[PDB]
């Protein structure tokens with residue numbers, strides 16, 4: 124019988140399933156995840172420059188100078204600001220800050 | 233004491249993927265947030281055993 | 283699947299074929315040999331990489347949501363913001379996923395088409411000097427060396443050389 | 454078509470074929486009958502349902518419509534709202550219409566390719582034991598009972614069994 | 626490329642084929658002849674024009690830009706205007722760009738599949754009265770121009786071509 128040539132394709136041990144429109148769970152030789160789901164869980168600097176850690180102070184608490192925010196009396200460059208949800212130290216003498224959410228916006232530039 | 237270029241509220245991100253699914257509220261140079269659990273791109277062919 | 287080479291007439295894969303994606307297996311006297319095609323596998327690599335590069339290059343705009351805060355007296359505004367962010371979010375999710383699904387299909391179909399096309403290149407080159415078995419192999423009507431083989435895999439096959447010889451052995 | 458089977462070399466389909474989407478029509482010494490194929494019909498069913506389920510799942514109970522009212526000194530904000538809802542209205546419409554067109558076309562071709570793939574499978578199984586009429590039918594060089602027919606339909610055609618008989622009939 | 630005809634088994638184009646997209650080359654005694662197929666070339670034209678008309682008709686569900694202005698006291702609102710318009714700009718760009726690409730790819734394979742189906746039409750018509758060379762090539766300016774309108778009496782040339790085949 125035959126001298127003989129054959130035509131065929133790669134297979135391997137890869138269990139990496141992908142989806143298409145017609146099919147689900149389709150096992151392939153080679154895939155590529157293109158969606159990141161991992162961070163480190165740490166809050167870092169950003170292009171080297173560190174953020175402004177307000178701690179228990181609110182923006183007013185800082186900008187006016189509630190004595191409990193005396194750390195913030197002089198402040199280097201920040202890359203962003205980390206303000207807490209309901210920061211303890213803000214308007215010690217109680218009251219109100221007019222157009223606060225627009226000031227809070229202005230700080231983002 | 234770390235460093236990043238992309239910054240979520242829950243963590244920080246090194247990757248070169250074109251998407252993430254962590255938090256929407258990111259600061260810095262980041263991938264496009266999506267509500268997806270998975271995005272896998274078939275590059276090879278079907279693995280059919282002999 | 284759509285071109286019916288992969289998981290089709292070529293029923294299964296070649297776990298020993300590992301120098302590429304597609305290719306040959308010649309079984310003459312001098313030896314055997316899983317040996318990948320060059321042209322088709324390369325072109326298939328160039329296409330796919332070109333594809334995923336064209337996928338990561340399409341969803342790369344910026345910058346921030348700029349993140350805004352609203353009063354207990356501007357709750358329509360706040361919601362409008364919210365509605366527009368979630369809105370865009372959903373759009374870019376759908377877009378990313380559907381693109382994924384569609385280019386996955388088209389990818390698998392591309393390999394299938396690739397393989398078939400190859401088998402069609404070899405078949406139409408050989409012609410009737412062989413038996414198209416239809417397991418994706420060919421059975422020769424002559425003696426093919428590690429020299430006649432390795433002439434088929436680079437596109438060159440003197441049909442009218444082996445023409446009369448194979449016509450004889452055929453009958 | 455795109456695969457040239459449906460409305461191509463097979464010019465039209467069979468109203469008598471009812472038990473499925475693709476299959477056979479035999480006419481031997483015993484009988485004469487339509488019979489659909491199991492595997493290709495199930496595989497295409499499986500495919501298309503997955504396709505339509507993957508359509509009703511991709512635009513699903515999310516993008517909403519709270520109404521909002523605005524004064525006569527909120528005309529910008531009012532407009533801003535209109536332009537946003539209309540905007541996303543336009544977008545989802547375009548997405549849905551395009552989706553439907555594309556998946557339609559791919560569906561059609563999917564059937565086409567399916568048919569061809571069937572023809573090609575039976576073909577490359579029968580080889581030169583038969584005659585390619587060019588119409589999507591094969592004329593047997595031998596005799597095929599309601600049995601040799603069933604050996605074709607499920608991919609178990611013994612070529613060497615009928616090989617020499619078909620040969621002797623062929624060179625004549 | 627996907628159907629293997631264009632820049633495939635039919636290695637190259639015909640610069641003298643200029644009455645259509647696809648078509649034939651007969652070379653018998655009476656003469657030669659570049660001559661474009663009709664049906665297939667017409668049907669391609671209809672499907673391509675149908676496609677681009679189907680692309681111009683999909684980005685016209687449109688707009689007129691009412692352009693707003695804001696104080697130095699309504700900045701979030703301005704940005705919300707900005708972000709929205711930029712956001713939709715990005716979406717329609719993507720759709721537009723992406724559609725072009727995908728419908729480009731499908732146009733190309735559409736031609737490919739066209740040509741391969743043509744060749745498969747002639748091939749399954751002639752049957753074994755000819756040599757399928759596989760360069761994309763395989764009788765009177767009367768037998769030729771009978772094939773190229775779908776009509777070919779096989780059992781006419783059957784016994785003659787069976788004769789000339791065996792000698």
Ligand SMILES: *[C@@H]1O[C@H](CO)[C@@H](O)[C@H](O)[C@H]1NC(C)=O
Nearest residue numbers: 134135136137138297299300
């Ligand atoms: C699959 O093959 C690779 C080598 O190509 C090997 O490293 C790996 O261990 C194999 N997978 C398993 C778990 O057998």
